[PDB]
């Protein structure tokens, strides 16, 4: 009804994606930095999931990782009746006319801010090649890189600008100019 109540009117709002060892953080921390903390803010939906599951759970706050699973699990039932559950809680407060929401990462995610937000919601998807992922470490790990948390989006095409990874990093500093001002457009 009332999608967001405790949320602000940005100017634009930027849903972030990406699958793990693609170099994500490496761009919303950028963007963060080139804008300023004051004029961007870094959202992430991971926050509410962590402080609601150990809420509901006898808790205090915002082996040892099997526990993640457990959010997870947990996270997407409550997503399934209230897609909205993680994103209203992320929006509160805050007063930065630019929001980057880092993690999004299905399709609900983007549904529900492009409803709430419509007119200033952009989404920006980060893809990485293969081989780049691999220098991180990257290997297929079944129940990690087969489960939803990593491919929610995978379907998905209709984002507004995507972020090919080259693994070089003066192509991605280009790639990351585009997009600040771009942003910057936004806050004349």
Not at 95 to 106: A, E, G
Not at 148 to 164: A, Q, R
Not at 172 to 184: A, H, V, Y
Request: net charge negative.
């Amino acid at each position: 009804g009332s999608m967001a109540p405790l949320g602000g009117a940005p100017r634009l709002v930027l849903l972030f994606s990406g699958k793990r060892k693609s170099g994500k953080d490496f761009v919303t921390e950028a963007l963060q930095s080139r804008l300023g903390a004051d004029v961007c803010a870094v959202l992430r939906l991971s926050g509410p999931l962590k402080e609601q599951y150990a809420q509901e759970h006898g808790l205090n706050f915002q082996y040892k990782e099997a526990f993640r699973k457990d959010m997870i699990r947990w996270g997407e039932e409550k997503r399934q009746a209230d897609p909205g559950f993680f994103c209203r809680k992320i929006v509160e407060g805050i007063s930065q006319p630019i929001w980057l929401v880092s993690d999004t990462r299905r399709v609900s995610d983007i549904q529900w801010f492009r409803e709430a937000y419509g007119a200033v919601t952009q989404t920006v998807r980060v893809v990485a090649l293969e081989q780049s992922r691999q220098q991180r470490g990257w290997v297929f790990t079944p129940g990690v890189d087969d489960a939803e948390s990593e491919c929610g989006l995978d379907n998905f095409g209709d984002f507004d600008w995507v972020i090919e990874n080259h693994g070089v990093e003066q192509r991605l500093e280009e790639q990351l100019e585009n997009l600040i001002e771009f942003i910057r457009s936004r806050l004349k």
